[PDB]
């Protein structure tokens, strides 16, 4: 076939696309997360949005994935969380179904990433001491 390059699908246009295609529009969703009865319906909502964004940023940063949108980690994928093979994950399923599937193991994975990052920082400090 013939192509003319990539296209822009919008803020959440890649929601229905597969994970492989949806991972090519991560910045599109990322950059839209920050931006007298009506006037006070704005201040606290803006504060809440700021706190949510900062919670996400801190959570990424304490894993060593700061300033990155795709980040590899040293935590092995315990197969108990999910048994699906990659072939049926990245090419025949969207991210919404993935979030539906793995909703139970989120916090333990987050803690594992946190402790792995702490171990990595300590190991780096030890290595640079020599």
């Amino acid at each position, epitope marked *: *076939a*013939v*192509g*003319i*390059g*990539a*296209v*822009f*699908l*919008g803020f959440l*246009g890649a929601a229905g696309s597969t994970m492989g295609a949806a991972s090519m529009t991560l910045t599109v969703q990322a950059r839209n997360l920050l931006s007298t009865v009506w006037g006070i319906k704005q201040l606290q909502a803006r504060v809440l949005a700021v706190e949510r964004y900062l919670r996400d940023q801190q959570l990424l940063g304490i894993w060593g994935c700061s300033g990155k949108l795709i980040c590899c980690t040293n935590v092995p994928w315990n197969s108990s969380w999910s048994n699906r093979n990659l072939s049926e994950i990245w090419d025949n399923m969207t991210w919404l179904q993935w979030d539906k599937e793995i909703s139970n193991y989120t916090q333990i994975i987050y803690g594992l990433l946190e402790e792995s990052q702490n171990q990595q920082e300590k190991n780096e400090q030890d290595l640079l001491a020599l």
Partner: nanobody, 122 residues
Framework: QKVLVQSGAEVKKPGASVKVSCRAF????????LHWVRQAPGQGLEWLGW????????FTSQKFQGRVYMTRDKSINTAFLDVTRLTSDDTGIYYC???????????????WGQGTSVTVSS
């Protein structure tokens, strides 16, 4: 919901310039490329080319380069085809069609405009 609407029919003298518009509804204008095709009275479909509304890149058929131009405006979700040096052989219905464009490559034209009839005579 996916619809394409063009301007009205055009009658022009030979050697003039004609501008055919095409506005999109029901889908993200920058999310798909737009083919420009033409069908002469009682003949087949001739592929003029296609444009990418997002990056603005265009491709014209080798037997049309330097004669037909394509542009878009995203503020109103419209694509313009400018055909210059009109002749009696350019008569027919111009169609603007949305490509399916799965996998960042041409797959098929599924949504078509109502077709703009352009006529050229002395």
């Amino acid at each position: 919901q996916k619809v394409l609407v063009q301007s009205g029919a055009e009658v022009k003298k030979p050697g003039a310039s004609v501008k055919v518009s095409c506005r999109a509804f029901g889908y993200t204008f920058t999310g798909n490329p737009l083919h420009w095709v033409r069908q002469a009275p009682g003949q087949g479909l001739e592929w003029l080319g296609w444009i990418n509304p997002h990056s603005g890149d265009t491709f014209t058929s080798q037997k049309f380069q330097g004669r037909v131009y394509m542009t878009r405006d995203k503020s109103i979700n419209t694509a313009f085809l400018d055909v210059t040096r009109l002749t009696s052989d350019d008569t027919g219905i111009y169609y603007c069609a949305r490509d399916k464009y799965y996998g960042n490559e041409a797959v098929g034209m599924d949504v078509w405009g109502q077709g703009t009839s352009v006529t050229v005579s002395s």
